[PDB]
Amino acid sequence: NDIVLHARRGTIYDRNGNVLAMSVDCKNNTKRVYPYGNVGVQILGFVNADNEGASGLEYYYNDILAGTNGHMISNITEAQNGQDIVLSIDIELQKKAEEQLTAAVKDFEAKQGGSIMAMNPRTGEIYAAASYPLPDFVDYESLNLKLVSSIYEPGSVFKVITTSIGVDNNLFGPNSTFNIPTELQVGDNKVTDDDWRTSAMDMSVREMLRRSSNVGMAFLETQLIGDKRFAEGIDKFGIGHTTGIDFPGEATGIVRSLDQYEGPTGGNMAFGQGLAIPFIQVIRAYTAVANKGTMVTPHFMVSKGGQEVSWPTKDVISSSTASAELDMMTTVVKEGTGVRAGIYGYTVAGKTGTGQQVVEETGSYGENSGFVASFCGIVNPSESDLMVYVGLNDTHQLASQSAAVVFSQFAKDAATRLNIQP
Numbered sequence: 226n227d228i229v230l231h232a233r234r235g236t237i238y239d240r241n242g243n244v245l246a247m248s249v250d251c252k253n254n255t256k257r258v259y260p261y262g263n264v265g266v267q268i269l270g271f272v273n274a275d276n277e278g279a280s281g282l283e284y285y286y287n288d289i290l291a292g293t294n295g296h297m298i299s300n301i302t303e304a305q306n307g308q309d310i311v312l313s314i315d316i317e318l319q320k321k322a323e324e325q326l327t328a329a330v331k332d333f334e335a336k337q338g339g340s341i342m343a344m345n346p347r348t349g350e351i352y353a354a355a356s357y358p359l360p361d362f363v364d365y366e367s368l369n370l371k372l373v374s375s376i377y378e379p380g381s382v383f384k385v386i387t388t389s390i391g392v393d394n395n396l397f398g399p400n401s402t403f404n405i406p407t408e409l410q411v412g413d414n415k416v417t418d419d420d421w422r423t424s425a426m427d428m429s430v431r432e433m434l435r436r437s438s439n440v441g442m443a444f445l446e447t448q449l450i451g452d453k454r455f456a457e458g459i460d461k462f463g464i465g466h467t468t469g470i471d472f473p474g475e476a477t478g479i480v481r482s483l484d485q486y487e488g489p490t491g492g493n494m495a496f497g498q499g500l501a502i503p504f505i506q507v508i509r510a511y512t513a514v515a516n517k518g519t520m521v522t523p524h525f526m527v528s529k530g531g532q533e534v535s536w537p538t539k540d541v542i543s544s545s546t547a548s549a550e551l552d553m554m555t556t557v558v559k560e561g562t563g564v565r566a567g568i569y570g571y572t573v574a575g576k577t578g579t580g581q582q583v584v585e586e587t588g589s590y591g592e593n594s595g596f597v598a599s600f601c602g603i604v605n606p607s608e609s610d611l612m613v614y615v616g617l618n619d620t621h622q623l624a625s626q627s628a629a630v631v632f633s634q635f636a637k638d639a640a641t642r643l644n645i646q647p
């Protein structure tokens with residue numbers, strides 16, 4: 226004769242206080258109700274029939290969201306309901322992120338979907354985030370956030386890390402100019418740029434970034450940085466380390482340590498080849514450039530039990546280096562491959578990338594690996610309020626015509642929705 230008094234799980238609020246998930250006895254059982262339907266459910270996760278969090282934040286914070294049931298046996302013990310959680314997510318921005326990512330995947334023929342995220346580079350709070358395919362009502366693979374749990378060869382979006390390391394080590398600056406050949410031998414393979422020249426070009430570090438020269442990056446790493454300082458910087462930037470994001474399934478990635486480097490490793494990694502990491506690591510690294518040199522922890526939960534949590538930060542580069550990098554990322558958007566990411570009335574510092582799909586458990590790939598088109602940008606970098614990432618997986622269209630285009634529209638909407646006026 227032991228009756229269960231079912232506790233209710235804690236409520237999940239978005240940043241404006243909208244209820245995203247709440248438990249109800251209309252189930253005797255309890256069930257979650259998601260008022261905005263499928264919007265943000267990928268982040269929220271689902272709760273199964275045993276009322277256990279099964280994916281997303283429901284799972285990640287299940288021990289605090291789940292209460293403790295009561296029991297009626299002449300003896301009664303109280304149900305303790307779970308603790309409420311407030312997230313950084315702006316539900317209306319989440320809806321746009323989802324619809325824009327879905328439309329982009331369709332328009333640019335991204336055969337393996339993509340991801341999108343808007344975050345505050347100073348506090349680390351995530352305003353919106355999504356991966357395609359998205360779930361509804363259910364395919365278990367759509368419950369992951371690809372940004373966190375899938376790994377890719379990052380490609381050219383990584384060049385901001387390589388230049389930051391050099392600059393922060395005082396080995397060159399934006400205007401430093403070098404005679405860059407058409408190709409360079411790295412290990413036993415040649416590095417080349419897809420371009421017009423048939424001769425070496427004198428290019429400043431700023432220019433190598435503007436045009437995204439792989440050859441220039443490999444030159445910088447091999448002739449100026451050196452593998453040791455390179456590998457130390459990668460490590461300081463958190464590359465190959467989990468970011469600490471509060472979401473399940475975070476991949477650490479596959480990144481060679483210095484003692485495992487071989488002939489071509491450093492040169493290739495300089496332009497984002499020879500490692501495979503989740504894009505959340507790239508995003509996290511960019512926060513250092515956007516936040517005066519301090520890298521933050523991307524995250525969803527702002528408060529639990531009315532207790533605001535402190536999230537770890539790390540000083541990676543100086544503010545001067547961060548400023549020189551932002552200056553160059555601004556050239557990318559004003560004068561280079563990122564020009565379609567520009568947004569009328571705002572300053573956008575960013576970088577395009579062409580990355581690759583990889584064998585998930587090894588980080589390598591063959592001839593038919595699909596390309597990943599990415600764009601990562603910071604809006605009004607002096608305000609420290611917004612950075613957005615857009616990635617399209619297995620598309621044939623260049624990041625300059627695809628991911629950068631999606632960013633201009635979504636980052637604009639993120640900026641209107643938030644404080645950001647210009």
Ligand SMILES: [Ca+2]
Pocket residue numbers: 381437562577578579624
């Ligand atoms: Ca590029």
